[PDB]
Amino acid sequence: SFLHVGKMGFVVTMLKLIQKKLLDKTCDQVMEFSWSALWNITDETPDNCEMFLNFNGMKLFLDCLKEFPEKQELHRNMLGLLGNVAEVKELRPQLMTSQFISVFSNLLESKADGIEVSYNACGVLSHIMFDGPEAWGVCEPQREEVEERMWAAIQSWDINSRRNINYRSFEPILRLLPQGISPVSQHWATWALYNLVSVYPDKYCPLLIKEGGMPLLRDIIKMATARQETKEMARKVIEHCSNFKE
Amino acid sequence: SFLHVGKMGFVVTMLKLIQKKLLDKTCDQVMEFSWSALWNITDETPDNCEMFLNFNGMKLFLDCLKEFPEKQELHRNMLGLLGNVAEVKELRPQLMTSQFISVFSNLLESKADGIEVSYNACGVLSHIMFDGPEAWGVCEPQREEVEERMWAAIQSWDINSRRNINYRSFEPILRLLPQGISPVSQHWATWALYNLVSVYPDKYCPLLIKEGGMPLLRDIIKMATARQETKEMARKVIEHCSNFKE
């Protein structure tokens, strides 16, 4: 259990603490815990994502990135949080600024904490791209050059990477499978499932099966808009999950 | 997404800071933050509960309770943390001393932050009772005395109490439903569900339904040996979750 985050104003409490550490130019255990807490309490919790945005959280995220460019665990926590914010469709338009898209695109090349910072940057952009080209506006970088960077990011990750992430539900990722708007978003979501069932099949094969990932992955194989590399990947997820279903 | 991992260096930073504020005899914003941080990172996270105990957590809890006997927010954070610790079967042996059981049973009548201190003291004791009488040994007060203080406390709580608590999973509470060792533990768990679906059905009716609470509550009603008081509370939970459903 935990306290009542809304009644306690707990998101604000963490952002006020982050602001104080940033001005003290200190990224210590307390700074990093504050971001880990926001990451955890935004998990499938849109009102907390919304409080983060409305308390000027993005500025704090960007100022911490600049002030602590090499603090890898700090970046992992900040990006876990942003991955949760990006799952809220009603909030994603606030992410569509040149300043923000620039940061996410650049983090696709992050080697911080293995692949976690690049992975969540890619997931943020995967949900953004899922809204389609109208949503992108005149943002520089070009939607195509970011999409190009996403394919490169995904393909650079060790498929057997051990992970510093967990999911109570695959629902937000599965969102990106039955869609032709954004093949790259579909490819990121397919890699995400493939990585987890390869390394952690005991935990994630049954979650994927129960939540209906099997037909969805079959549909990708017959989907004109799906890329060959996505179709072959989904075949291998289905295969891992079948060696488990016995 | 989330990450519920042990954080040995942070558990230790929080405890060493609590020790410092103890000796300074100031229960300030930092004192209360440290206990709330421990509450947060022990949520569904047994590893942090284990390091809490290994690094002298229980004595710091006891001392803080003695030093600051009227700091109700402190008590609420402290008992939220201890409620999380007590969920860990492997760790409950470290709680079986007369000193601790007397402390916890003497919090059953606490009026601090509504019912939260009373509720969490009862939860700690419910998991302890679930372990059976052999686990109690020679601890004082006697198990039967604490059991009656437990029924009394539960009955004293406003069934529609507003709450300063949050659960992301009901797993540890559901643990207490299909069991015949401790009726008072079963009753505590049923109340915990009943209050939450009664005050916040939109959050907790779907969670209870999703994690399989309905067959468990139905089983209690069908259990020839179950207490009718508990049967009827279980039935009201089923009723409200059915009223929630369409």
Author numbering:
A (entry chain B), B (entry chain A): 514 to 759
Paper text:
ZER1 and ZYG11B, the substrate receptors of the Cullin 2-RING E3 ubiquitin ligase (CRL2), recognize N-terminal (Nt) glycine degrons and participate in the Nt-myristoylation quality control through the Gly/N-degron pathway. Here we show that ZER1 and ZYG11B can also recognize small Nt-residues other than glycine. Furthermore, we present the crystal structures of ZER1 and ZYG11B bound to various small Nt-residues and uncover the molecular mechanism of non-acetylated substrate recognition by ZER1 and ZYG11B. In conclusion, we propose that ZER1/ZYG11B not only targets Gly/N-degrons for proteasomal degradation, but it also has the ability to bind a defined selection of non-Ac/N-degrons by a conserved molecular mechanism of substrate recognition and target their degradation through the non-Ac/N-degron pathway.
To understand the molecular basis of ZER1/ZYG11B-mediated binding of non-Gly Nt-residue peptides, we determined the crystal structures of ZER1 bound to either SFLH-, AFLH- or TFLH-peptide, as well as the crystal structures of ZYG11B bound to either SFLH-, AFLH- or CFLH- peptide. In line with our SPOT-array results, ZER1 binds to XFLHVGQD peptides in which X is either Ser (KD of 1.3), Ala (KD of 1.6), Thr (KD of 3.1) or Cys (KD of 3.9) more potently than to the Gly-starting peptide (KD of 4.2). The free α-amino group of the Nt-residue forms hydrogen bonds with the side chains of Asp556 and Asn597 in ZER1 (the counterparts of Asp 526 and Asn 567 in ZYG11B), respectively. The main-chain amide of the third residue on the peptide is anchored by a hydrogen bond with Asn553 in ZER1 (Asn523 in ZYG11B). It is worth noting that the side-chain hydroxyl group of Nt-Ser makes additional hydrogen bond with the side chain of Trp552 in ZER1 (Trp522 in ZYG11B), suggesting a critical role of the Trp552 in binding of Nt-Ser. Apart from these direct interactions, a network of water molecules occupies the bottom of the cavity and mediates the contacts to ZER1 via water-mediated hydrogen bonds. However, on the other side, the Water3 in the Ser1-binding mode has to move down and away from the corresponding Water3 in the Gly1-binding mode (~1 Å) to provide enough space for docking the side chain of Ser1. Simultaneously, the Asn633 shifts toward Water3 to form a hydrogen bond, thereby leaving no space for Water4 in the Ser1-binding mode. As a result, the Water3 mediates contacts directly with Water2, Gly593, Asn633 as well as Ser1, while in the Gly1-binding mode the Water3 together with Water4 establishes a contact network with Water2, Gly593, Asn633 as well as Trp552. These rearrangements of water molecules might explain why ZER1 is able to recognize other Nt-residues in its narrow substrate-binding pocket.
